[PDB]
RNA sequence: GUUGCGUGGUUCACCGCGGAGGUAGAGCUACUGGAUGGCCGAUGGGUUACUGACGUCAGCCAAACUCCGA
RNA sequence: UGCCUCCUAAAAUGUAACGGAGGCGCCCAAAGGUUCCCUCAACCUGGACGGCAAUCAGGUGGCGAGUGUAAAUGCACAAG
RNA sequence: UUACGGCGGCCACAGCGGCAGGGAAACGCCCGGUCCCAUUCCGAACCCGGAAGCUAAGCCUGCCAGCGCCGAUGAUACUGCCCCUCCGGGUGGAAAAGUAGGACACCGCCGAACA
């Protein structure tokens, strides 16, 4: 089906991404999952695979932002940002999660660099 | 008598295989495994070589493993 | 009614299996339902005589350290050059269950024209419960025209046992000369 | 028909860098951007 | 019997120890001729134990030959020293073992057969029996 | 807004539905793409194809061609890995189906001796394939300022699981069959 | 090998523990080849007694075969 | 007659013979670097020229393809 | 705590396949291409904008050994060291195959309702 083939499509690209990068204890993976509806994010640091902090625009705070779905990432983006430093991390290591680069995956990044978080 | 000496060359042997094995302390940069492609793939904290060799990237003790059928070596510091 | 008598193995390996097969037992592993197998050797002369008669199969009564049990051999490991029994390998029958079991097949008839007819496989497996009404399955011939080869399917299989082999095995084949 | 040429900087006319290449492939005189050290930094580096 | 083509024209001798662990046992005959030494049986040889069998029993039946002999075994040209090569190939050989079935007849007669058979081991390098299909 | 498709939505959706009992609204296949390709050998000498086989069906299609390159050598056809030998369009969404609609109105009933093609023509999973002859086929390319006579094979790829659906909804689109 | 000057248990043996292996053996519908007998059957051959690809059922073989493996 | 690969070579390394097999004395300005994307061969089904085998479509197919070049070790996570 | 969603460990005892059941949030297919970006042609994919429709498929759950996979014990092959003319024997190791069987995975990190 198309929807098998984009999701095994998209394992394989992550997969591929994921050989070099992997994210540790200070400088963690930011890791993406959008849909079609939401984008959720989620800062890894698997030498144990404990997720440190998460963000996403099912909460009512990012649902009831004005504006598309370009706002609702720089939305979760400032939300993962500011979730980081509240745990104590300022530098990661950005997983497009499979997906391009660009469009709402690259306005969430743009966001979390904006306000503090560094990679 | 027949000249069959169609077949007497040989290359020099390049003394490949295991270097350090389990369980065995080494300093950074010393060479774990040479060999020809990647029979054993670089762990955790060792690197690749240009050649195929499995340096130690840091001091520790050597280990092998499996990842993902990918026989593998790797320092643990 | 095949009364067969055992003794535990005290010790297994390579000298005690030698010692044994010289002393005239030979060594043996019950395991059946489950259970945890037994290490046992059987009297020789004893069992090389039970399976001459009541077929291979010859489901046996096993009297180990006493206490009564029902064995059917599985495996029967006989040495190339002697061909003498070197290990049997035995299981367990609870009055009644479907244990798959190879079971010889022998032909009757005689084929009346220049016929040539060949045996391709001694034995089928067949499906049967304990004590064996089952035993080897006749292929009765009259001696057609060698065109008919005769597969697992239109077989003398008795009534409670099943033939889940194949439905395409040839047993025997009738060519010209 | 692989001969060794040789690259020499565009300012300083340093003759650097050694290399070879396939007169046939590219008859002309080839460029590529090398570190100067006389000049500290990335220039042209035209064959001589 | 001759390999219709080798991967390898010079191979090293096959080695003579062990007993044979595949083939042992009767298989598509019912009677069978099993070796219980080591040799290297030859084409010849077994080409002549053959129709040994054949001609002993003339018609019916029908004989197996589970033995290939597809080993070469080399020999430098007459008149040589040693040491300028290997030598061509000009034996074909199989490898046998104590324990391997070499030939096997079905025949419908018992006599005749194991009569054959005897003729055949008679025509080998080496002490062999008739073994049958239990 | 192409009106076959509309029409399409107006009746052929639910005549698929009194016909087959799919279960489900969205088991109802649809044309899915539709490719056109040339196969051309007569390119490999001379290596003429493209004011031939590029500007006929960027007029017929409406959309650019791929130049579908050689990826094997075959010594019997003289032809090498890295040539242009073939040419192929895959048709999607409303010009796809307005090419259909042009094709079955003012195209198709126009090739000569043609009654009808055949409906035995599908491989199996509900897909189509056939060929013309001659690009005179379409108004929109005239016979003074054209070449040599060539012609497209033509797969129509639906979401239909079998041969009889695939043909079912195929003669609801309007294709000819005998 | 000897000998001088240094060093000092670093040598070696045994026990335990951590490791890499592809030999022996074995296996091969796990590959590459070799290769026995059946059964079906593409082809070819003179409608088809001739050929018998590929499969399928069994039994095998290998320094430069290996799913394995001391 | 130097170099490279395999087997001999006896599961570390090494190991001889006028032992068994092959290659090399280059090539590539991209066939290097990097970023991103992709998965092959073969088989089956259907299809104008077109056939067993050109391109196309759909399946099946985890590597039997490919790797500039011998062989080995590798590489489908791809090094393709 | 659930027939839910989220990222890894592991790489078949986990895979593949077959049969059923599942849509609250979610994952998805899905509707479009004025709007960044994209097709060696194609808004199929990638990317963007939406929520009319739907669990048909992906995904999730449960059940199936079917195709595969794992796999003892024992025995054997082989073997270190001894004893001994081999055959052999003692002793310490011990396969491959096959059999009994196992097996339709297991474990780790946040949200929805619940609570
Ligand atoms: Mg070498
Ligand atoms: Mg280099
Ligand atoms: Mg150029
Ligand atoms: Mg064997
Ligand atoms: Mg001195
Ligand atoms: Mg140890
Ligand atoms: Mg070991
Ligand atoms: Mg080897
Ligand atoms: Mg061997
Ligand atoms: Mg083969
Ligand atoms: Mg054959
Ligand atoms: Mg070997
Ligand atoms: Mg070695
Ligand atoms: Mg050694
Ligand atoms: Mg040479
Ligand atoms: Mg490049
Ligand atoms: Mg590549
Ligand atoms: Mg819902
Ligand atoms: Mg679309
Ligand atoms: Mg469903
Ligand atoms: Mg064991
Ligand atoms: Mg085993
Ligand atoms: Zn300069």
Redesign the pocket.
């Known amino acids: 089906?198309?929807?098998?083939?984009?999701?095994?499509?998209?394992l394989?690209?992550?997969?591929?991404?994921?050989?070099?990068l992997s994210g540790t204890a200070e400088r963690p993976?930011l890791?993406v999952?959008?849909?079609?509806?939401?984008?959720?994010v989620?800062l890894?640091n698997?030498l144990?695979?404990?997720?440190?902090a998460?963000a996403?625009?099912?909460?009512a705070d990012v649902?009831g932002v004005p504006?598309?779905?370009?706002?609702?990432?720089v939305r979760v983006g400032q939300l993962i940002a500011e979730r980081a430093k509240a745990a104590g991390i300022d530098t990661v290591v950005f997983?497009?999660?499979?997906?391009?680069?660009?469009?709402?995956?690259?306005?969430l990044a743009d966001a979390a660099r904006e306000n503090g978080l560094s990679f | 008598?027949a000249?069959?000496?169609?077949?007497?060359?040989?290359?020099?042997?390049?003394?490949?295989?295991?270097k350090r094995?389990?369980?065995?302390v080494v300093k950074a940069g010393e060479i774990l495994?040479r060999?020809?492609?990647?029979?054993?793939?670089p762990g955790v904290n060792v690197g690749r070589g240009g050649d195929?060799t499995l340096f130690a990237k840091t001091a520790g003790?050597?280990?092998?493993?499996?990842?993902?059928?990918?026989?593998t070596?790797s320092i643990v510091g | 009614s095949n009364q067969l008598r055992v003794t535990v193995?005290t010790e297994?390996?390579?000298?005690?299996?030698?010692?044994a097969?010289?002393a005239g037992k030979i060594?043996?592993?019950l395991?059946?339902?489950?259970?945890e197998?037994q290490?046992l050797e059987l009297p020789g002369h004893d069992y090389a005589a039970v399976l001459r008669h009541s077929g291979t199969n010859a489901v046996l009564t096993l009297d180990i350290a006493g206490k009564e049990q029902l064995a059917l051999t599985?495996?029967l490991?006989i040495?190339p050059?002697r061909r003498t029994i070197?290990?049997a390998?035995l299981?367990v029958v609870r009055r009644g269950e479907k244990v798959?079991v190879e079971v010889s097949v022998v032909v009757e008839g005689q084929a009346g024209p220049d016929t040539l007819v060949?045996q391709?496989?001694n034995s089928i497996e067949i499906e049967a419960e304990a004590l064996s009404i089952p035993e080897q399955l006749t292929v009765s011939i009259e001696g057609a025209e060698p065109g008919t080869?005769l597969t697992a399917g239109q077989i003398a299989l008795p009534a409670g046992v099943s033939l889940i082999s194949?439905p395409?095995?040839?047993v025997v084949?009738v060519?010209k000369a | 028909?692989?001969p060794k040429?040789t690259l020499a900087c565009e300012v300083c006319k340093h003759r650097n860098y050694i290399?070879?290449?396939?007169r046939?492939?590219?008859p002309d005189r080839?460029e590529?951007k090398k570190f100067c050290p006389n000049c500290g930094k990335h220039q042209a580096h035209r064959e001589t | 019997?001759?390999?219709?083509?080798?991967?390898?024209?010079?191979?090293?001798h096959?080695?003579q120890?062990?007993?044979?662990?595949?083939?042992?046992?009767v298989?598509?005959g019912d009677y069978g001729i099993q070796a219980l030494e080591h040799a290297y049986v030859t084409n010849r040889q077994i080409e002549s134990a053959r129709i040994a069998i054949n001609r002993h029993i003339k018609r019916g039946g029908?004989v197996?030959?589970?033995?290939?002999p597809?080993?070469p075994l080399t020999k430098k040209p007459a008149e040589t020293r040693?040491?300028?090569?290997?030598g061509s190939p000009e034996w074909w050989v199989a490898?046998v073992?104590p324990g391997?079935?070499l030939f096997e007849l079905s025949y419908p007669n018992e006599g005749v057969a194991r009569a054959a058979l005897t003729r055949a081991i008679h025509k080998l390098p080496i002490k062999a029996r008739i073994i049958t299909r239990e | 807004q192409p009106r076959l498709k509309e029409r399409y939505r107006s009746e052929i959706r639910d005549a698929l539905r009194k016909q087959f009992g799919?279960?489900?609204?969205?088991?109802i296949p649809?044309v899915?793409?539709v490719?056109?390709?040339?196969?051309?050998?007569?390119a490999?000498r001379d290596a003429k194809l493209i004011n031939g086989a590029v500007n006929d069906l960027a007029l017929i299609?409406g959309?650019?061609?791929?130049?579908?390159?050689?990826?094997?050598s075959?010594?019997?056809?003289?032809?090498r890995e890295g040539m242009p030998?073939?040419?192929?369009?895959?048709?999607?969404?409303?010009?796809?189906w307005e090419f259909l609609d042009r094709l079955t109105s003012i195209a198709l009933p126009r090739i000569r001796d043609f009654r009808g093609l055949?409906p035995?023509?599908?491989?199996?999973?509900?897909?189509?394939?056939?060929?013309?002859?001659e690009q005179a086929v379409f108004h929109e390319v005239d016979v003074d300022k054209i070449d040599r006579?060539?012609?497209?094979?033509?797969?129509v790829?639906t979401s239909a699981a079998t041969d009889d659906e695939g043909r079912a909804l195929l003669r609801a689109l309007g294709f000819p069959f005998k």
Do not use: C
């Open positions: 089906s198309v929807s098998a083939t984009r999701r095994i499509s998209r394989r690209r992550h997969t591929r991404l994921r050989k070099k993976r890791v999952h959008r849909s079609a509806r939401h984008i959720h989620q890894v698997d144990n695979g404990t997720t440190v998460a996403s625009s099912i909460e649902r504006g598309d779905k370009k706002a609702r990432s997983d497009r999660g499979g997906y391009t680069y660009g469009g709402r995956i690259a306005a | 008598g000249s069959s000496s169609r077949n007497g060359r040989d290359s020099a042997a390049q003394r490949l295989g295991v094995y389990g369980g065995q495994v060999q020809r492609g990647t029979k054993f793939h195929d003790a050597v280990e092998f493993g499996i990842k993902r059928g990918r026989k070596v | 193995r297994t390996g390579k000298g005690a299996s030698r010692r097969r010289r060594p043996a592993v395991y059946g339902h489950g259970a197998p290490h599985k495996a490991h040495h050059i070197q290990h390998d299981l798959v060949t391709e496989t080869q194949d395409d095995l040839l084949n060519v | 028909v692989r040429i290399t070879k290449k396939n046939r492939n590219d080839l590529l | 019997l001759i390999p219709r083509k080798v991967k390898h024209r010079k191979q090293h096959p080695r120890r062990g007993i044979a662990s595949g083939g042992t046992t298989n598509f029908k197996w030959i589970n033995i290939f597809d080993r040693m040491g300028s090569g290997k490898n073992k391997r079935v | 799919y279960g489900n609204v969205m088991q649809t899915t793409k490719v056109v390709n040339m196969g051309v050998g007569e490999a299609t959309q650019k061609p791929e130049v579908r390159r050689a990826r094997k075959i010594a019997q056809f003289k032809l030998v073939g040419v192929r369009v895959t048709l999607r969404g409303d010009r796809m055949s035995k023509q599908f491989d199996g999973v509900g897909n189509y394939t056939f060929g013309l002859a006579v060539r012609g497209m094979d033509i797969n790829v």
